[PDB]
């Protein structure tokens, strides 16, 4: 009997959010038509200001979106993830080419190679640190659940923030490393095999939410990770 309305959680009662309607606004998750008028149930909670407050809220999140899309920081991250894998691709086909030379002669140039590979395997660990720095700022609620590494790939595979924020939870537990990348998360990986799929579904569901809250709020919400760890224990 849990309903997620923009001001709080109704069942017959009402529990508002601590000066955070903006959060539940982004969290008003309900998978089936409501049997009541959120408006009414809300009139019986907030004064007449109902609308004024419902407005000030819908305005705050709208601005944050336009605020981020002005900074386009999420783009910087996609380009970043797309460069990573690339920088990584070479690291390999350049080890494939060196062990090629090295299988023949161990010249004083195969050495300059090694150092250059290394210097390159450095830039990789350099770009990987970068996606972490941003992802923790532009997308905490997500990095939190799956971790910078993964969180950032979804975003690149999604294309952009707004492009991801509209992805179903089902496309999320799949869009993965083209058993999506979310499948490699500990909570999923350490289950049986058949019931782990029921973890992805929940993780994906709540992840899509994290994604929205990141993009419109910018601030973390441990209610997220909370639900996940809990639902995880439940799996026994």
């Amino acid at each position: 009997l849990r309903y997620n309305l923009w001001f709080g959680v109704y069942d017959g009662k009402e529990i508002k959010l601590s000066e955070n309607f903006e959060e539940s606004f982004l969290k008003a998750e309900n998978p089936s038509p409501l049997p009541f008028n959120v408006s009414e149930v809300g009139a019986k909670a907030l004064g007449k200001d109902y609308y004024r407050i419902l407005r000030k809220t819908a305005l705050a999140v709208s601005e944050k979106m336009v605020e981020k899309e002005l900074r386009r920081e999420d783009r910087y991250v996609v380009a970043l993830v797309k460069a990573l894998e690339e920088i990584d691709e070479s690291i390999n086909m350049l080890n494939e080419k060196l062990e090629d030379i090295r299988a023949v002669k161990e010249s004083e140039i195969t050495e300059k190679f090694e150092k250059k590979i290394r210097e390159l395997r450095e830039l990789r660990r350099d770009v990987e640190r970068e996606i972490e720095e941003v992802m923790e700022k532009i997308a905490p609620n997500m990095t939190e659940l799956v971790g910078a590494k993964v969180a950032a790939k979804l975003l690149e595979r999604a294309g952009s923030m707004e492009r991801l924020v509209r992805l179903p939870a089902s496309k999320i537990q799949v869009i993965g490393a083209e058993h999506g990348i979310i499948f490699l998360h500990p909570f999923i990986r350490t289950l049986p095999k058949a019931k782990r799929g029921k973890m992805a579904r929940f993780l994906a569901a709540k992840l899509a939410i994290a994604a929205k809250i990141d993009y419109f709020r910018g601030e973390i919400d441990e209610s997220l990770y909370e639900s996940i760890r809990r639902r995880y224990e439940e799996l026994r």
Partner: protein, 209 residues
């Protein structure tokens, strides 16, 4: 003449009784804003004939606010109601906030309309769902959005761009199909193309009993 709530025909310019500025066309004279039928598939429907009866005390769900031009007017029509305008592209949305800022009866929903359940805890039971979304699954989004919020015996107006649905198929046959596909849930009230104003769209008015 007078055709709607706050809709009149100054000399020959369609306009709405307002006391607000020009969102797109500086067409604002003494308590009226010119509704440019060339920039509003709605002002066009009105001109094409068929209109919309309704009291200012209305609860509107607009799917496709866009920059907020057709919206800004609906807000003048429903001055004693509330508008939940949804648009998922930031570009146009950036311009939208300027309207919701100026006016006090429009609620911004920067979410994907394609999945109403996502914002189902914000939208109340609405009296009418206006849709002007141009995508293949148009009728679907309009349907699911109705289930969730269109209160029994509520009405909807949906604009349709034939090509939006069928890339290569005669606009007639596409409009032929869509109307049939949408009949299964709504009761038709009128359809008609906005031929001069929008050489590719057609409005369908209807409601679910």
């Amino acid at each position: 003449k007078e055709l709607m709530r706050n809709v009149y025909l100054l000399d020959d310019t369609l306009v709405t009784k307002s006391k607000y500025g020009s969102h797109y066309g500086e067409k604002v004279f003494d308590g009226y804003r010119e509704w440019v039928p060339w920039r509003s598939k709605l002002a066009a429907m009105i001109l094409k004939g068929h209109r919309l009866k309704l009291r200012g005390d209305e609860r509107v769900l607009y799917l496709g606010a866009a920059s907020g031009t057709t919206v800004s007017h609906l807000a003048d029509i429903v001055d004693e109601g509330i508008i939940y305008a949804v648009e998922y592209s930031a570009k146009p949305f950036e311009k939208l906030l300027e309207l919701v800022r100026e006016r006090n009866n429009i609620i911004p929903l920067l979410f994907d309309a394609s999945k109403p359940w996502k914002y189902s805890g914000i939208v109340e039971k609405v009296d009418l769902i206006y849709q002007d979304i141009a995508q293949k699954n148009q009728i679907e989004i309009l349907k699911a959005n109705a289930e969730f919020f269109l209160k029994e015996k509520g009405e909807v107006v949906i604009m349709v761009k034939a090509r939006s649905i069928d890339s290569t198929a005669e606009p007639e046959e596409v409009f032929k199909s869509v109307l049939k596909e949408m009949e299964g849930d709504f009761k038709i009230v009128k359809h008609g193309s906005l031929m001069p104003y929008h050489r590719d769209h057609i409005f369908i008015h209807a409601y679910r009993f």
